[PDB]
Design a protein around this ligand. Structure first.
Ligand SMILES: CCCCCCCCCCCCCCCCCC(=O)OC[C@H](COP(=O)([O-])OCC(O)COP(=O)([O-])OC[C@@H](COC(=O)CCCCCCCCCCCCCCCCC)OC(=O)CCCCCCCCCCCCCCCCC)OC(=O)CCCCCCCCCCCCCCCCC
Ligand SMILES: CCCCCCCCCCCCCCCCCC(=O)OC[C@H](COP(=O)(O)OCCN)OC(=O)CCCCCCCCCCCCCCCCC
Ligand SMILES: CCCCCCCCCCCCCCCCCC(=O)OC[C@H](COP(=O)(O)OCCN)OC(=O)CCCCCCCCCCCCCCCCC
Ligand SMILES: CCCCCCCCCCCCCCCCCC(=O)OC[C@H](COP(=O)(O)OCCN)OC(=O)CCCCCCCCCCCCCCCCC
Ligand SMILES: CCCCCCCCCCCCCCCCCC(=O)OC[C@H](COP(=O)(O)OCCN)OC(=O)CCCCCCCCCCCCCCCCC
Ligand SMILES: CCCCCCCCCCCCCCCCCC(=O)OC[C@H](COP(=O)(O)OCCN)OC(=O)CCCCCCCCCCCCCCCCC
Ligand SMILES: CCCCCCCCCCCCCCCCCC(=O)OC[C@H](COP(=O)(O)OCCN)OC(=O)CCCCCCCCCCCCCCCCC
Ligand SMILES: CCCCCCCCCCCCCCCCCC(=O)OC[C@H](COP(=O)(O)OCCN)OC(=O)CCCCCCCCCCCCCCCCC
Ligand code: HEC
Ligand code: HEM
Ligand code: HEM
Ligand SMILES: COC(=O)N(OC)c1ccccc1COc1ccn(-c2ccc(Cl)cc2)n1
Lengths: 386, 29, 70, 64, 117, 49, 60, 242, 29
């Protein structure tokens, strides 16, 4: 309070915006790797605005769905821009979030006191996967039918209530009009849960502030968010919109499959069923197990060892700048997630059955050889001392 | 004391089974 | 929550007394040599296992293709 | 109107005398076949990948 | 154990000079990397230290956050005057942890607890 | 898919079921054999679904 | 260098004139660039337009 | 090795480029190859008659092209169907009555819809050109069934379509020699337009906004380095030594 | 007062000639 007024940004109507978006204290040495988080909140707003206008011309019926998407591309004013922004915009939303996650692994941003910020973001990554999968079915092409068949039948290897799971998810005995109608209703709903879980994920970071490239206690050198990290975030929103415009105007079909331009026929099978590029690493782990019930049970330990990183303790050094051995393991895990994506679009044959079984093992040896440096490393100040 | 803590706490595991089949009758399993 | 008592002296100039742009193309040969003689074991760990696996697959597929030909 | 492509597909053989000579040797090895099951599909697909590569360079500048 | 001592092992006397090289360019000591927000016991070891020792820590940390914003290092006059691995914190932190293992074997509430976020 | 596989059987490149033409699985995670329904002749060649 | 003080001399010591210059300058610039893209296009493609069809009027 | 086909080469199409357009006199000629050689067994069913106006034909020429077909119209006051001549709003006519009658007249095989066929396979413009002008004689050791022909670019090697582009099958109305390679090139430029009728409105909007956005990138890197110069050049004295 | 009057007027003639600058569009001038 004071006795009379002052700057209007310090009034109750704009206090929550002032103290969290203008005057918020920030470490002064943050690099451009701290810019991909506001870039991911712009990619979520683009998908909501473009999809609300796409849904004014789409019909969720098996006799009318493929022809409603060609009606947008051909007869609606600017309608080809509305579709290409939405199909390619889901690839931009996954490039930005994948570079966000690998920042937090290099600088160990999951550590104390920031465990709830990590665990709220593993829930966000799960809501993004369900939303993109369920929305790839509405165009109703040959890859929108034979991809919803391969994934929803994978719940038929669960013990002995699982044959009642798949025919309740389907609404019948196969993928058909009962399945296309309920996949549309859930697809309008799940982006609005994703919005409320992103505002909650930001209230958990504004309780302790941000980490920095050195990993240290930083409260002695801090500046404000406006104008310093607003004008260098604006350099990032313009470099993004150039890169996004070479995918809409000059190459709008490079990141897709041609088989989704054939209308859906349940009598023949396509020769090769391959997902979008951003589902290729978990598709190669899922096909690496020669048992099917052990394939669903290798996807759930991917999201268990992610949710259980910030609860191992003894590591006082955070940043990989001062840690020369864990830094070399980071570049050796990134080479493995790019090799698991290559395997996930190859035939299931030799030699890709051995080269697709070792990288699922190397991927799970990253989360077990982290805590052993949490033991051998804490005896460094008693040995190297001078 | 501390035994009676768990000697209570494992019957809410079972108050929850009187409850877990109370509405759904999960049948096949 | 945010207080560290401190003691220091800082001096600062005005923005409209300095040269804003020319400090980018300043010593770009010296800048390039510093980045690649310090980050050459982090790229031998990122591209190394990928060039060596792609060489194995192309050699495996060129010896079961010449063994099926009559 | 003689065809421009088949005209060029005749004038590109003096540049691929090697992939052709490897196809001629294959029909010798299956001459007088016993059981079927012995084709020359591979060396056929190696010779027409040669021929298709020069003609793609020069055809479209001969068509109106 | 036997794989970490640098005057017996060769691959620990090259891991030692790799962290020693990287600490000198920012002018930091190894104990400056210990955060009172990571471990609540590190917050207590720093309240029992003299004011002149904690003040030199806060000034080494401000000099280094200034060098990384500007993308530069200490000049090589000042880099030969730096002592990493000269400690000020390990003995007081072992004492606080030894007093906490005694208050738990004998009953007794903890003196400070972490807030639940 | 027919006309391919480790036998010439029903190749399934969905998750890698290599069948044989008899129908019982050779190499893959399909937990059962294929379903066997009931059908016999009338006289000659039409056997009813 | 005398055009730099003289251009700030006249217009923006004010904040509504300024919003004229960024809105009305967004137009002369949008028409200066739409004109140059629309003349580099019909210079790379001569003989390929719709009005260059020799049999246009006559189907019968 | 014959399980996915032979690989097609790369042809320099006249609409490939960052500022290249369609050859509209070659779309005009390719609609004539379609309507006389192709429409007897293939459908388009997405393209209307009003979509060629301003692209290859005048509105008067389409109002006399569309009036040569009989189209079924809805019930009269007696509740019966009839036929009428076509209009501008109508779609291209269907050769068959359903998919079942289409396989019966073709030996079981179904001839697909061609309104998106350059987008539906991989490398879809060089594949349709090389398939239609690619009927060869089989190699030594391969046998084909009866009613099937040998095309090396079809996956499998045995297609159920006979060779249909022979020399002089179309009378061009502008004095072009209707060779095999000429009609093949002209029908793919028509089929490319039909899949993507927006390509010229799209390449002209993308040149305007990539250029305009690289000017805002030069403004934003000056604005960034101007607000950060008081911090990046400050002097600081501290008291500590080691 | 009287400055805020006219300073209401200068940008009140901006809207007029800023929405007279996004819809009807004589564009040679
Ligand atoms: C660019 C991203 C920002 C970044 O950190 O670079 C990352 C990294 C370099 O990081 P960095 O420059 O060292 O960090 C800045 C310094 O710490 C400190 O920075 P500095 O002070 O030295 O100044 C350097 C500045 C100099 O510029 C200035 O003049 C300003 C001062 O140049 C920049 O880094 C500007 C970066 C633009 C900001 C973010 C742009 C959004 C990315 C949109 C593309 C991807 C989204 C999808 O290198 C990469 O570019 C990796 C790829 C990520 C970008 C995608 C573009 C390549 C496409 C490959 C991925 C997509 C595959 C599809 C095929
Ligand atoms: C060796 C570990 C074994 C492997 C990990 C456990 C199994 C993996 C299963 C994944 C779920 C992890 C569940 C563990 C969460 C609680 C653990 C915990 O409380 O850690 C204790 C830590 C310090 O404990 P302290 O205060 O010193 O007292 C202990 C003295 N006896 O104080 C804290 O951390 C609590 C303060 C932060 C907790 C805030 C919530 C963090 C997220 C926990 C929920 C788990 C993720 C679920 C998704 C959350 C969002 C919906
Ligand atoms: C709206 C999003 C944009 C604005 C972000 C900030 C919103 C205002 C909320 C204030 C905040 O960020 O932190 C609140 C909460 C408690 O923080 P607290 O320690 O009490 O406040 C002092 C911080 N120095 O810090 C938190 O930990 C919040 C955690 C989520 C809230 C609990 C809900 C989870 C329970 C299920
Ligand atoms: C300043 C003035 C602005 C100038 C415009 C900037 C030019 C943007 C670059 C366009 C580009 O490189 O993409 C074109 C190229 C062709 O794309 P495609 O759909 O395959 O067309 C078939 C042609 N062979 O795209 C490709 O070859 C696909 C390769 C992916 C590259 C995407 C990045
Ligand atoms: C695909 C290629 C891009 C990889 C995507 C994964 C994202 C990388 C995680 C982001 C964190 C990060 O890379 O930090 C930048 C770091 C710079 O190196 P530095 O911080 O100075 O380490 C100290 C060495 N003494 O990184 C580096 O060492 C080099 C900079 C990385 C440039 C892209 C490779
Ligand atoms: C048990 C195996 C012992 C492994 C450690 C042996 C070598 C000791 C060591 O870590 O040396 C540090 C080494 C390079 O140190 P540095 O001088 O900073 O790098 C030069 C490039 N600028 O840093 C490294 O090269 C570490 C590379 C990561 C190790 C790969 C396997 C994990
Ligand atoms: C971690 C993120 C996931 C890792 C990337 C997984 C994709 C691996 C790249 C690849 O080579 O395959 C994807 C795709 C191949 O296309 P495809 O139709 O399957 O053809 C068969 C291949 N000859 O090739 C592509 O189209 C590349 C797709 C774009 C890749 C973007 C970069 C991914 C990483 C960005 C965040 C870091
Ligand atoms: C997500 C959980 C979905 C639960 C589910 O499987 O749906 C119940 C499903 C409905 O089928 P049902 O109820 O048997 O048919 C009407 C006869 N009363 O079938 C069932 O009743 C399954 C009962 C077992 C449910 C346990 C799985 C949780
Ligand atoms: C004899 C009737 C007939 C004629 C005339 C005809 N087609 Fe076909 N077409 C077919 C049939 C039948 C198939 C199916 C082939 C198959 O399934 O193997 C087919 C398939 C195709 C395919 C698909 C090839 C593939 O890989 O799926 C294309 C493309 C095609 N035709 C283009 C054309 C073009 C262009 C013309 C005009 C020169 C034409 N057709 C004329 C009957 C015809
Ligand atoms: C819709 C998706 C997401 C949005 C909008 C979002 C938003 C943000 C924002 C705005 C920040 C601010 C600081 C910064 O940019 O670094 C941030 C930080 C952070 N995010 Fe996300 N995020 C998303 C997904 C994720 C995911 C998938 C993870 C991890 C699995 C994650 C983990 C983190 C962490 C650990 C930080 C703090 C790191 C640090 O401060 O050093 N976020 N997030
Ligand atoms: C309120 C929010 C949204 C609505 C109403 C919406 C609506 C739609 C509609 C109507 C379609 C079918 C039309 C078409 O095929 O292009 C579609 C497709 C799709 N949606 Fe959304 N969408 C929303 C948000 C999102 C989000 C947040 C994502 C991704 C994270 C997403 C991913 C997709 C994808 C991948 C497709 C497939 C498009 C294609 O490949 O052709 N959508 N959406
Ligand atoms: C954009 O969608 C596609 O690319 N889809 O879906 C039609 C596709 C198409 C063809 C083949 C496979 C897929 C799906 O691939 C995968 C791989 C793993 N998941 C998955 C999905 C949901 C959950 Cl909870 C967990 C895992 N999905």
């Amino acid at each position: 309070m004071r006795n009379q007024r002052f700057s209007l940004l310090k009034q109750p109507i704009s206090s929550t915006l002032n103290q969290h978006l203008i005057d918020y204290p920030t470490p002064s040495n943050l690099s451009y790797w701290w810019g991909f988080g506001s870039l991911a909140g712009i990619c979520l707003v683009i998908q909501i605005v473009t999809g609300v206008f796409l849904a004014m011309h789409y019909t969720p019926h098996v006799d009318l769905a493929f022809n409603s998407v060609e009606h947008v591309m051909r007869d609606v004013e600017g309608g080809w821009l509305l579709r290409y922004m939405h199909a390619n915009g889901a690839s931009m939303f996954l490039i930005v979030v994948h570079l966000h996650i690998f920042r937090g692994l290099y600088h160990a941003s999951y550590s104390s006191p920031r465990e709830f910020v990590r665990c709220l973001g593993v829930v966000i990554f799960l809501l993004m996967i369900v939303t993109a999968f369920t929305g790839y079915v509405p165009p109703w092409g040959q890859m929108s039918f034979w991809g919803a068949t391969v994934i929803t039948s994978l719940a038929s290897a669960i013990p002995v209530v699982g044959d009642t799971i798949v025919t309740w998810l389907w609404g019948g005995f196969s993928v058909d009009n009962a399945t296309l109608n309920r996949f549309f209703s859930l697809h309008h709903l799940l982006p609005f849960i994703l919005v409320g879980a992103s505002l909650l994920h930001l209230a958990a970071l504004h309780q302790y502030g941000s980490n920095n490239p050195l990993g240290v206690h930083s409260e002695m050198d801090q500046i404000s968010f406006y104008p310093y990290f607003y004008v260098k975030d604006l350099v990032g929103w313009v470099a993004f919109a150039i890169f996004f415009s070479i995918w809409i105007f000059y190459a709008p079909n490079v990141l897709g499959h041609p088989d989704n331009y054939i209308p859906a026929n349940p009598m023949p099978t396509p020769p090769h069923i391959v997902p979008e590029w951003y589902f290729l690493p978990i598709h190669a782990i899922l096909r690496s197990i020669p048992d099917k019930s052990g394939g669903v049970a290798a996807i759930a330990p991917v999201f268990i060892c992610l949710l259980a990183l910030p609860f191992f303790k003894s590591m006082y050094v955070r940043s990989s700048s001062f840690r020369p051995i864990h830094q070399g393991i980071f570049w050796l895990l990134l080479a493995d997630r790019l090799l698991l994506g290559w395997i996930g679009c190859q035939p299931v044959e030799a030699p890709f059955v051995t080269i697709g079984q070792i990288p699922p093992l190397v991927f799970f040896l990253f989360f077990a050889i982290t805590p052993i440096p949490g033991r051998v490393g804490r005896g460094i100040p008693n040995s190297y001392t001078d | 004391i501390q035994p009676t803590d768990v000697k209570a706490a494992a019957m809410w595991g079972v108050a929850a089974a009187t409850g877990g089949l109370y509405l759904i009758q999960p049948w096949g399993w | 929550k945010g207080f560290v008592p401190m003691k220091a002296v800082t001096y600062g100039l005005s923005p409209f007394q300095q040269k804003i742009m020319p400090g980018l193309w300043k010593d770009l040969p010296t800048k390039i040599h510093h980045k690649v003689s310090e980050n050459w074991i982090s790229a031998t760990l990122l591209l190394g296992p990928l060039v060596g696996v792609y060489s194995y697959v192309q050699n495996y597929q060129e010896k079961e293709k010449l063994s099926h030909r009559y | 109107p003689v065809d421009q492509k088949k005209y060029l597909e005749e004038s590109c053989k003096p540049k691929c005398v090697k992939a052709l000579l490897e196809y001629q040797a294959c029909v010798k090895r299956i001459q007088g076949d016993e059981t079927g099951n012995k084709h020359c599909t591979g060396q056929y697909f190696d010779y027409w990948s040669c021929i298709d590569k020069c003609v793609a360079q020069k055809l479209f500048s001969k068509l109106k | 154990q036997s794989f970490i001592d640098p005057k017996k092992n060769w691959f620990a006397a090259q891991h030692m000079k790799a962290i020693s090289k990287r600490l000198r360019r920012f002018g930091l000591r190894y104990d400056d990397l210990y955060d009172p927000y990571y471990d609540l016991d590190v917050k207590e070891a720093l309240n029992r230290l003299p004011k002149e020792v904690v003040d030199a820590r806060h000034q080494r940390l401000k000099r280094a956050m200034d060098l990384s914003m500007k993308h530069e290092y200490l000049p090589e006059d000042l880099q030969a005057m730096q002592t990493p691995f000269r400690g000020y914190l390990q003995e007081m932190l072992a004492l606080v942890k030894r007093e906490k293992a005694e208050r738990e074997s004998l009953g007794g509430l903890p003196l400070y607890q972490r807030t639940i976020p | 898919l027919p006309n391919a596989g480790d036998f010439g059987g029903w190749f399934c490149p969905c998750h890698g079921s290599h069948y044989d033409i008899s129908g019982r699985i050779r190499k893959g995670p399909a937990p059962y054999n294929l379903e066997v329904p009931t059908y016999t002749f009338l006289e000659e060649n039409k056997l009813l679904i | 260098g005398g055009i730099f003080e003289a251009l700030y001399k006249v217009l923006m010591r004010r904040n509504s004139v300024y919003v004229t210059f960024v809105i009305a300058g967004a137009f002369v610039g949008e028409r200066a660039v739409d004109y140059g893209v629309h003349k580099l296009w019909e210079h790379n493609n001569v003989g390929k337009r719709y009005e260059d069809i020799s049999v246009l009027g006559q189907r019968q | 090795e014959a399980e996915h086909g032979l690989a097609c080469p790369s042809y320099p199409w006249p609409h490939q480029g960052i500022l290249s357009s369609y050859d509209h006199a070659s779309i005009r000629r390719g609609h004539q190859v379609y309507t006389q050689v192709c429409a007897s067994c293939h459908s388009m069913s997405l393209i209307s008659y009003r979509d060629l106006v301003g692209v290859a034909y005048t509105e008067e020429e389409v109002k006399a092209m569309a009036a040569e077909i009989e189209v079924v119209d809805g019930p009269n006051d007696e509740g019966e169907m009839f036929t009428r001549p076509g209009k501008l709003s109508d779609r291209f006519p269907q050769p068959y009555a359903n998919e079942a009658a289409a396989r019966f007249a073709n030996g079981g095989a179904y001839p697909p819809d061609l309104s998106l066929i350059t987008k539906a396979p991989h490398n879809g413009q060089n594949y349709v050109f090389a398939l239609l002008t690619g009927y060869r004689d089989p190699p030594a050791g391969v046998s084909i069934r009866e009613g099937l022909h040998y095309n090396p670019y079809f996956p499998g090697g045995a297609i159920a379509m006979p060779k249909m582009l022979n020399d002089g099958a179309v009378e061009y109305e502008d004095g072009t020699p209707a060779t095999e390679s000429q009609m093949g090139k002209d029908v793919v430029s028509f089929l490319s337009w039909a899949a993507e009728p927006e390509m010229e409105e799209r390449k002209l909007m993308g040149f305007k906004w990539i250029f305009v956005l690289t000017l805002a990138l030069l403004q934003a890197g000056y604005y960034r380095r101007l607000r950060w110069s008081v911090l990046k050049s400050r002097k600081l004295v501290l008291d500590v030594v080691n």
